[PDB]
Amino acid sequence: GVQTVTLIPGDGIGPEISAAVMKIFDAAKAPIQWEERNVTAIQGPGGKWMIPSEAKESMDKNKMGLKGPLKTPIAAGHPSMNLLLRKTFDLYANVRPCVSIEGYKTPYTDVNIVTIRENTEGEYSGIEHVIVDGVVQSIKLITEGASKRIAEFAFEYARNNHRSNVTAVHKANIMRMSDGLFLQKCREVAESCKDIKFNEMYLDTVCLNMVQDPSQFDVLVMPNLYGDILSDLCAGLIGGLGVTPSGNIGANGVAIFESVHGTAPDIAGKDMANPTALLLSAVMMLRHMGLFDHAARIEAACFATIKDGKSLTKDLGGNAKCSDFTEEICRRVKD
Amino acid sequence: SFPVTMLPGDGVGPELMHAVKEVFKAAAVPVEFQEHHLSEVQNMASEEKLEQVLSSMKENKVAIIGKIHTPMEYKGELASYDMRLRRKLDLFANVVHVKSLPGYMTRHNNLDLVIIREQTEGEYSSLEHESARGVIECLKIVTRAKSQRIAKFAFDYATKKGRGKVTAVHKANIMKLGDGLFLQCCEEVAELYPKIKFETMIIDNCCMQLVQNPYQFDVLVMPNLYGNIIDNLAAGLVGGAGVVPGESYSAEYAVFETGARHPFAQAVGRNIANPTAMLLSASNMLRHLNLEYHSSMIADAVKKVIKVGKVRTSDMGGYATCHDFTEEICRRVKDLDENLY
Ligand SMILES: NC(=O)c1ccc[n+]([C@@H]2O[C@H](COP(=O)([O-])OP(=O)(O)OC[C@H]3O[C@@H](n4cnc5c(N)ncnc54)[C@H](O)[C@@H]3O)[C@@H](O)[C@H]2O)c1
């Protein structure tokens, strides 16, 4: 049949690249009905920020999601709608794969890396308050049960996708109790899976080793104590924010696929944004849904365009409009 | 004529310090080192030995140090003697020099970068406690008093060293009250420095930018959001932990160290370490002591020995030994004395 999926066009360069991936999916006869829904910060009755009700009933019905980036005030205002979205649907695994693009040459060759980050605790414990004048205190909490659920996710991912190694990336030398628990739970799941090789590294070691040689790494698992800056380091390895895709995975096959990048305000509206990121997340969603043939087709179209280099885009090689780039992929998918 | 506190630390620290002084000996450097052997791993640690070090600093006001190792069984790093030192010395600004070495080829050549981060709060303020059967809570603090001090230090450093622009790296999009306070404290002290450019950037973007196109930045000031992670990322751009030098400052004290200090920084055996980071910081130290001739001489001797490519250690892709490499820098540093013009 024809399955539907909730689309959130988002803010900034969101609506452009959303339109860009819808066209490539239209051009591919992809059996997918978009349900365009808007998510802005509506403030609930008790002051607690809530999603738009139209958006939540949409996600509950479809349990699949492709969203663009959302603006979050870079000073004060509403809390990030992405943290809110991830927690209200309990998408506890954030999966970010960095693989090099064969057509696009970069100082780093043949990187293949999956960053599995826990997606609901840590700095997503939104409690942060003022103690006295000019003194701010933040309270983050990690639970045992979440540490175990992400380590199990990580090891299952390593098995479902035929990855040989898993590395727990921790700061247990400095955050004894928190990361000591995460390592404690990572180690238990590792004993039940001798087929996957396990090791632990300190995050500061990993960052240094990564920019020197990513070929040492396979899947990396992390608590949400240090943000998503390891996969931002990884994003630069393969070509920046225009190409790195994302997935927020939950249980019972619920997921919201987005990209690592943000609203891109400096380029917003100028029809110069790169839609490879959101496109590659949408082929993540496709392979999640089992539409494997539409996936390989759309993905081959995208890479073969990047490889031709004729109609690239400003974040990559040369100047061509997002519209121009989306069209040369549409031309590729149909043939 | 010039006393300096030396703290060899654990690991290869004693080898690096032996490199600094056999070079300093070969260059007739007028510096007398006061060594304190403070090692918790070897059972030479106590708070009386900590105090003997502050006494040495109260007189010398300048120290070159290794890494005091901490035993991960029964101690996290916050209670390590390496933290008690920085608190007793009130070191608050960490300064890392990410500068390419001509002849040590990496993927980011011709790079000239400095990272300033705050060293007394954020992560190093962490208080952890257990709220439930299996729930851990970490408490962190940010303050205006300590953000103003580090942003002022950054612009002072920027003018004093002729640097052009200062980027403030923050995560005030999700840590609104905490890091917006630091961001504000930065924009306030930027108005007092009109000859210095100033911009901000969300921390997610900066890491991507450091590995994609690091040449944009010049001076990075940031809070202790995530510890030494960025210093270690950036130090990978330019050769890694055996080359990147670092200094930590107080209101009165200057402590010169290495810049990349992950727990396995040069976890090598008895003659395999690279003295470049330590030797460069020693020369940076001499500059601070206003011995600008000796400071410049050492630094040129080391920069030139690795441009020729003859003697190279393992990390630099070579089979030479730490003694081989220092004996070559002493060979070149004594030539540079006898033929100075
Ligand atoms: N929805 C999300 O997942 C998400 C993630 C990060 C940031 N944001 C939000 O957006 C803002 C972040 O903006 P920022 O400037 O710090 O980072 P950004 O990711 O929006 O962009 C930073 C840099 O990369 C460029 N860039 C980003 N995406 C690009 C693309 N698809 N194609 C070509 N160039 C691209 C931008 O032009 C800019 O130079 C904040 O409000 C923040 O809360 C949202």
φ and ψ of A313, to 5 deg: -160, 165
Structure tokens at A30: 């992809």
Structure tokens at A304: 């073969």
> Coil, strand or helix: which one is B313?
coil
φ and ψ of B238, to 5 deg: -130, 20
Note whether A79 and A126 are within 8 A (CB): yes
Beta-bridge partners for A165: A197
Helix (H) or strand (E) holding B96: strand B93-99
Measured over the CA atoms of residue A171, residue A172, residue A173 and residue A178, the dihedral's sign is: positive
Note whether B277 and B241 are within 8 A (CB): yes
CATH number at residue A19: 3.40.718.10
Q: Tell me the chain A residues in contact with residue B229 when contact means C-beta distances shorter than 8 Å.
A: 203-204, 207, 226, 229
Nearest CA to ligand 1 atom 30: A242
Kindly write down the DSSP assignment for every residue of B208-270, as one continuous string.
HHHHH-GGG-SEEEE-SSSTTHHHHHHHHTTT-TTT-EEEEE-SS-EEEEES---TTTT---T
Closest CA to B119 of B223, B8, B24, B22: B223
Q: To one decimal place, what's the resolution in Å?
A: 3.0
> Coil, strand or helix: which one is B86?
helix
- Which residue, chain included where needed, has tokens 């540079």? B336
Note whether B182 and B223 are within 8 A (CB): yes
DSSP summary character for residue B78: G
CA A69 distance to own-chain centroid: 11
d(CA A181, CA B49): 34
Note whether B66 and B14 are within 8 A (CB): yes
> Coil, strand or helix: which one is B318?
coil
Pairing of strands A197-202, B31-35: unpaired
Closest CA to A67 of A91, A45, A46: A91
Structure tokens at A262: 């943000």
Residue type at B170 in one-letter notation = H
Q: Is A127 on the interface with B (CB under 8 A)?
A: no
Cβ within 8 Å of B, A 161-180 = 171-178
Residue B277 C-alpha, separation from nearest chain A C-alpha, in angstroms: 15
Q: Do B226 and A228 touch (CB under 8 A)?
A: no
A312 is in which domain, residue-wise?
A: 1-335
Residue type at A7 in one-letter notation = L
Ligand 1 pocket check: which of A18, A241, A244 to mutate, most ligand atoms within 8 Å of Cβ?
Answer: A241
Note whether B321 and B271 are within 8 A (CB): yes
What is the number of domains present in chain B?
A: 1
Q: Do A207 and B78 touch (CB under 8 A)?
A: no
Beta-bridge partners for A97: A114
What is the number of domains present in chain A?
A: 1
Nearest CA to ligand 1 atom 26: A264
Note whether A22 and A327 are within 8 A (CB): no
Nearest CA in chain B to A214: B236
Q: Is A200 on the interface with B (CB under 8 A)?
A: no
Pairing of strands A197-202, A165-170: parallel
Residue type at A3 in one-letter notation = Q
B274 is in which domain, residue-wise?
A: 1-341
A292, B101, B111, B148, B299 from B108: Cα distances, Å: 39, 10, 6, 32, 21
Give the orientation angle of helix A276-289 with respect to helix A14-27, to 10 degrees: 50
Give the orientation angle of helix B203-212 with respect to helix A229-238, to 10 degrees: 30
d(CA A162, CA A132): 52
d(CA B229, CA B76): 17
Can you give the length of chain B in residues?
Answer: 341
Of the candidates B144, B235, B260, which has its C-beta nearest A134's C-beta? B144
Structure tokens at B253: 């004290």
CA B231 distance to own-chain centroid: 8
d(CA B306, CA A99): 34
DSSP summary character for residue B126: -
**Residue A256 Cβ < 6 Å to ligand 1:** no
Radius of gyration of chain A (CA): 20
Query: In chain B, how long is the greatest CA-to-CA distance?
Result: 73
Per-residue H/E/C for chain A: CCEEEEEECCCCCHHHHHHHHHHHHHHCCCCEEEEECCCCCEECCCCCEECCHHHHHHHHHHCEEEECCCCCCCCCCCCCHHHHHHHHCCCCEEEEEEECCCCCCCCCCCCEEEEEEECCCEEEEEEEEEEECCEEEEEEEEEHHHHHHHHHHHHHHHHHCCCCEEEEEECCCCCHHHHHHHHHHHHHHHHCCCCCEEEEEEHHHHHHHHHHCHHHCCEEEECCCCCCHHHHHHHHHHCCCCCCECEEECHHHCEEECECCCCCHHHCCCCCCCCHHHHHHHHHHHHHHCCHHHHHHHHHHHHHHHHHCCCCCCCCCCCCCHHHHHHHHHHHHHC
Residue A73 C-alpha to ligand 1 middle, in angstroms?
A: 13
Residue type at A47 in one-letter notation = G
Can you give the length of chain A in residues?
Answer: 335
> Coil, strand or helix: which one is B207?
helix
φ and ψ of B29, to 5 deg: -70, 125
Measured over the CA atoms of residue B90, residue B93, residue B94 and residue B97, the dihedral's sign is: negative
CATH number at residue B165: 3.40.718.10
**Residue A14 Cβ < 6 Å to ligand 1:** no
A204 is in an annotated binding site: yes
Compute the CA torsion angle A296, A302, A307, A308 (nearest 10 deg).
120
Residue A277 half-sphere exposure toward CB, CA atoms < 13 A: 32
- Which residue, chain included where needed, has tokens 């060759």? A109
